[PDB]
Curated annotation (Swiss-Prot), chain B:
One Pfam family this sequence matches: NAD_synthase
Reaction(s) this enzyme catalyzes, per UniProt: pyridinium-3,5-dicarboxylate mononucleotide + [LarE protein]-L-cysteine + ATP = [LarE protein]-dehydroalanine + pyridinium-3-carboxylate-5-thiocarboxylate mononucleotide + AMP + diphosphate + H(+); [LarE protein]-L-cysteine + pyridinium-3-carboxylate-5-thiocarboxylate mononucleotide + ATP = pyridinium-3,5-bisthiocarboxylate mononucleotide + [LarE protein]-dehydroalanine + AMP + diphosphate + H(+)
Loss of function: phenotype: Deletion of this gene leads to a loss of lactate racemase activity.
Organism phylogeny: Bacteria, Bacillati, Bacillota, Bacilli, Lactobacillales
The protein's name: Pyridinium-3,5-bisthiocarboxylic acid mononucleotide synthase
From Swiss-Prot, chain F:
Positions annotated as active site in the UniProt record: 166
Phenotype upon changing residue 29 to A: Loss of activity
Protein name in the entry: Pyridinium-3,5-bisthiocarboxylic acid mononucleotide synthase
Enzyme class: lyase
Reactions accelerated catalytically: pyridinium-3,5-dicarboxylate mononucleotide + [LarE protein]-L-cysteine + ATP = [LarE protein]-dehydroalanine + pyridinium-3-carboxylate-5-thiocarboxylate mononucleotide + AMP + diphosphate + H(+); [LarE protein]-L-cysteine + pyridinium-3-carboxylate-5-thiocarboxylate mononucleotide + ATP = pyridinium-3,5-bisthiocarboxylate mononucleotide + [LarE protein]-dehydroalanine + AMP + diphosphate + H(+)
CDD domains on file: LarE-like (cd01990)
Disrupted-gene phenotype: Deletion of this gene leads to a loss of lactate racemase activity.
Amino acid sequence: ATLATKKATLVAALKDLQRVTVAFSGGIDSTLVLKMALDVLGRDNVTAVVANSELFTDEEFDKAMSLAEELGANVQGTTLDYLSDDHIKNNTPDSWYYAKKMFYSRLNDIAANNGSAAVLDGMIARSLLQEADFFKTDVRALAQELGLTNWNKVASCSVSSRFPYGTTLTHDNIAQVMAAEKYLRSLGFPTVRVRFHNDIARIELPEARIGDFLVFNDRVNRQLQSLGFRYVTLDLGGFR
Amino acid sequence: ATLATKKATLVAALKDLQRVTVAFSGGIDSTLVLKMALDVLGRDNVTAVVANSELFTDEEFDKAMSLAEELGANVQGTTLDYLSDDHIKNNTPDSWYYAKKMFYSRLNDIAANNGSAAVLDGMIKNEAGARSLLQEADFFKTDVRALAQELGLTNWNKVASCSVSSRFPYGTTLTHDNIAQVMAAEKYLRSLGFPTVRVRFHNDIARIELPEARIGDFLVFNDRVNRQLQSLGFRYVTLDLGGFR
Amino acid sequence: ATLATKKATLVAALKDLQRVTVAFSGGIDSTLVLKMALDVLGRDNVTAVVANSELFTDEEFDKAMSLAEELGANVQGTTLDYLSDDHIKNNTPDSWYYAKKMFYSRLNDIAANNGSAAVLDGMIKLKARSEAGARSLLQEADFFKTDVRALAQELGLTNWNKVASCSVSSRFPYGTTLTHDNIAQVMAAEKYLRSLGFPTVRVRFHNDIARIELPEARIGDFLVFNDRVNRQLQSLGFRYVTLDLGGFR
Amino acid sequence: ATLATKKATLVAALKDLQRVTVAFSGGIDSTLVLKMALDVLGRDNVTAVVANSELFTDEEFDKAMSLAEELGANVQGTTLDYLSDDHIKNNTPDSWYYAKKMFYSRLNDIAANNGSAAVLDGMIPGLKARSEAGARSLLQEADFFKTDVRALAQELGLTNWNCSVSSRFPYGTTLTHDNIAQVMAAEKYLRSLGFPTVRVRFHNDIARIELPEARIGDFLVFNDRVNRQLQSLGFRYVTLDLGGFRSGRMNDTLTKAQLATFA
Amino acid sequence: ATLATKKATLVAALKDLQRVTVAFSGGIDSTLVLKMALDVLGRDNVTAVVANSELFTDEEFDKAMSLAEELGANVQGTTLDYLSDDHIKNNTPDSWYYAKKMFYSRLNDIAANNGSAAVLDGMIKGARSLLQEADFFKTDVRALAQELGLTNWNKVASCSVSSRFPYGTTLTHDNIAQVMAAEKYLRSLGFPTVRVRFHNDIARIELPEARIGDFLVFNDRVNRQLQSLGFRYVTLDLGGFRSGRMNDTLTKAQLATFAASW
Amino acid sequence: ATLATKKATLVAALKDLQRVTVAFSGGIDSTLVLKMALDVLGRDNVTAVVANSELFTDEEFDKAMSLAEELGANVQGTTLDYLSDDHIKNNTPDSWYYAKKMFYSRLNDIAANNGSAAVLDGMIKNKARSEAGARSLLQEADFFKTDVRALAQELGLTNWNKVASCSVSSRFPYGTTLTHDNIAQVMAAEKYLRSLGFPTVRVRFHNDIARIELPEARIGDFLVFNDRVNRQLQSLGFRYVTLDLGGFRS
């Protein structure tokens, strides 16, 4: 339960696997797994996969593709068509599960195609970090120990959560929500939700940021209206 | 011309009518007409009528009844059935016409039965069955304030009142339940110190409009307002970033 | 009875007294009494009296003095030494009765020396009042607050002190002994806070702690003043300067 | 002494003059002199003059004109060209004096041409502007304080009544028709947002906005609109003075003194 | 001179001591001493000691225990009974020193029994403060911690709960629990640096001034929550946490006069 | 096209120079050059030079010196008198070039006097330099920002100036004359605001007016400090202290 002991448990696991395919999102967790896998197995035994999809931002895709190459890995993008599944398209309350099936099936296929022994992710499918009992504390210490300083500081969540259960997702309403959230982040609010209620936009901010938001009220109102919302509102209860 | 000329115009018009019924809302315009009617014709020749209805608050009705009494008038409450008309209940842009028709129809019946020569309302500069003497005498808001002060009037409702129908989208059917929900929500917001407020009804969403200069003061109340309006039946309680109108 | 009858009752009562001393606070009730006394008896036969004391602000005193003069009354200030009464100094629930008793006793002395037939106050539809023989003509004529407002409108009165102020003793817990120093400390603190744009404020005294009560809707506006209020009230002697998260009262 | 004694002094002075021209600003003081002149001398023997100029708002002028009309006085508007005087155009510290000189010179010309025996005003670098012009301040000669003005106005039944734009420019800055218009439009816009007490001080390409400090937190919701509106009026930079309107007046005693020392 | 020379002084001091016991609080200073001790002497010749007591939170103890383990140290918990000392129990102005004396007495007992040559603490510019002997200032501590790859330490300074009570007030489990629960609630709202000062029926909350404007949306919830914990009045100190450090020159001088008057 | 080939080009370039003087700012780029120069040529053959001047803060000078020392380099400060150049003192739009010219001219003098074959800076793929003959080895080896980060990670570099500063000349309008006093005044004002918790700030100088630029999302936080900032910046010599309603870089 020392860090040196957990790092060794991780090393021993990667060595036994020989070849791996890493589901790589660009956060600090998957960043740590990919770097360790490269160090222990070498570039030509590691394949980093970054999923491109409608449910997540193109900025997160382009950032993870760039970061994985930056760590010295063979990186491959793959495009998932989440809305082709009827459960996801109609935002069923179990649609999270159908999306994971699509995801891991694709990476399972890529991994069997390239001869990998397992698909790896960054939980703290094999979650080696979790298996070695890494906490966020340990992930921070080891990443700094390897010289890592660059990763996506905001981990994102599926845009489906912005729509009520049963609401049909469309390319247009997803783009409208993602454009609104991107604008709000560019103003200094990295944690924000633009909940979609047809003609009404309902913005969720952490309550301690709401006073800071006041200077932007008018600009946000006009911008989100130009994106197609008729009414632009701020939820009084805050984020969650 | 001058305020004295406009007031003299108003006096001559009242003397010519001799006996009037005054539609009294409690605002400054309606307070000025009622007081001038009383000052020129006397209590026995003026009837003050305050309309009670589902579209306006009980608070505003109670305030108007006491102020009319305070002014020296013999006052009469009357209750209107706006929702009994299908045009008003279904909330179209034509609801206004049917509301005015019912209002003036009720006032004319009162006026017919007490022998008044006209129904007077408080419309100012900027209905065929009523006389708007301030408008005929070319009173602007500024002349109303000046003559009110000269007469020593100080007690009126200072916040403009508006039919609760404006809180529901056109084509939405008004119900006793959703009206009460909006009324209770706005009453709570006024009790916190926001006399000018709208709770716009969007089914499970409340969209609160405040004057933008007040939005910064509202932050200390977010959580209490959120919880209170949820207990009134809204699922989501929101602040419109554009502010009041 | 009609408002015209109540006014007539008040006129006849004033005519019968012929010369009066009016306890004037600046509120709408004493303004109406003072204005009716002037209209019926003439400025030469009415004296308006405003009490100054340690328990109320100088600003309320000066405003009442100006309002009486603007109404056309000869006005006289008188200063009461409320802290000389131990019932008041010890801040008990009956302190206000002894304050009232000292007030009306001073008014009787003034009235005796100027030939007034009665002391009038602004009470509407009280033991210290009756013990001193002072007269509440609005109460005797059946004026309620709506009648007061109706007659004030008819007389064209539009200016009066809208906030009936409150004795500074409410800033100290019952049983806490009032002193010249702790009163002055609280009074100066509230005076500074009003000067910043907060007319409704309390500085509650908790020895080395000042606990400021503001209307909650004003608390956000206060932020720009935190450090100045902190240092200003510490220089008045408080060790800690705090804002009550619950707001006013 | 006595209000009655003071009112009588003012009455005797008016009777002795018989016909007067009154400088009328619409404030309570000039409202009182105008009403007393009318009551003692009659409408035919009083001329009220309201001055229009570039240094005050059209709103203020119209207000004064209608109030003089409301009191029942024959009223004459006259427009002054204050910027024709180099002290005013260059906004020197004695600019007020030369403005008064030009104002009283115009009133004297009106008074000479209508047969008035004096110019009256509402008062309570050389000779006094009035003394030089021969203007009379009857409320001052009768020792009226402001409470006396207020007392007599209620007694006479007066119930309705109402700063030069040059104060928005630094001394030595040249006033122009354009930059005056720019300052006045900026303040009118800020007042329309709900800030009745406001100054837009002109520092060439910078606007420096003074607000009462208790309003500054509420103002934040308007920052971007104010910035873009005042830039379209010609300012390059739009700023908020952190000291607020009448800086120092709300500071604690120690820092109030420090701000005095810095000035 | 240079950081390298200061680090070299610290290395030489550790090698001469050979075996040491480290008073480990989890702050950045203690973290550096512990890490350097491990690198110079090895895991078998260093014992990290984390004190648990009623005057500090369980969260700070758990954080310190995990960080010492993560750095690779044999770590040992030890529990101090500060409240059995009358100066500490009655919170006299010298309470800090009787607490420190009891603390170092415990560390000496442990060090004597494990064969350590000294007790080390994290003090900077019979216990040894090697950072101070090597002329480390705060900026040198941060520079060397960064060079050593140290990332996890207590970003918010820990501090004994005694500082929340006036001198002469008797500490009890009830009023300590009341203060700790109030501060934990405020931390859960997003204010990691906070003090709830105890004044019998008054709670006086200190926040960094740059956070006070953000607190407004929580006023009513904080008021209710702290009243249910037993306070009658819940107040915000207008001077904030660490009053005066962010003031202009003049009023920083004034606030220091005020603070000195008590 | 790979990181390994770019690093090799940079190594071979350094080996061919043998001896160098490194313009060291403390940012990640010049940190990478200084670390690669030390690793390839040895401490005795590298001189890190940090410029002290009126256009940058003393604190930034001190940080760069300590960062170079931490890397294990011989470092020397050099003091430039930028205000002696009339283009810089009168703050024309061309002042940024004359400052760079004076900088690279000084470094060439140091390089000539210590036997260096070149002056190196940290410019990457993303005018005064070329005219002075200074070499940007990261630019010549095709390093983009991501390549700089990749190699710093590989070398174990994790410490550098994360915020690159701007010459204080940017706080003055073109045509405004720089003086020792107004520069100091601007610097002390920005230092005070940073101490309040506003790391990104500019105090723009408009003679008797200070115009403070903050990120708009911080302006609400700022309110509690209005009066202290007003009085502090007045004690530094400004008559009026203002907040730009347009925010940072309005």
